[PDB]
Amino acid sequence: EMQLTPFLILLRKTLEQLQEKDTGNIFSEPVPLSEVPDYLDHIKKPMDFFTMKQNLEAYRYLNFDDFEEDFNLIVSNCLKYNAKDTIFYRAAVRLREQGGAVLRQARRQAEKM
Numbered sequence: 001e002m003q004l005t006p007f008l009i010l011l012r013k014t015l016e017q018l019q020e021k022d023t024g025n026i027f028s029e030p031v032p033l034s035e036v037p038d039y040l041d042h043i044k045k046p047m048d049f050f051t052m053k054q055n056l057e058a059y060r061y062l063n064f065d066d067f068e069e070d071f072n073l074i075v076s077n078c079l080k081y082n083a084k085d086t087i088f089y090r091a092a093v094r095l096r097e098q099g100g101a102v103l104r105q106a107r108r109q110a111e112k113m
């Protein structure tokens with residue numbers, strides 16, 4: 001129960017803050033199946049920040065949970081596909097940690113709306 005426009009502005013800013021935590025930009029775009037042809041064998045719903053931006057603008061995020069669910073998919077897909085001893089797996093752990101703080105603050109701002 002709030003205005004749509006300020007909420008989407010908040011999600012756009014939050015998405016930007018999450019992208020800033022991904023300093024290697026390993027989650028900015030979909031995982032390239034050209035270089036990872038087996039990626040879809042067990043990853044049933046790939047996700048990335050560019051796709052999240054498309055979903056945001058397509059009005060697919062009308063509450064904080066749905067936005068946060070796709071961010072969590074970025075993290076969980078990466079933990080699932082990659083071995084624990086890789087840079088990619090550790091990057092997903094770090095994103096989960098740093099992104100979670102971004103999300104908790106942004107959700108507190110949405111709840112004031």
Ligand SMILES: c1ccc(-c2ccncc2)cc1
Pocket residue numbers: 026031032035036078081082088
């Ligand atoms: C090249 C680029 C990205 C990746 C990748 C990134 C994150 N999760 C799985 C694969 C692998 C090879």
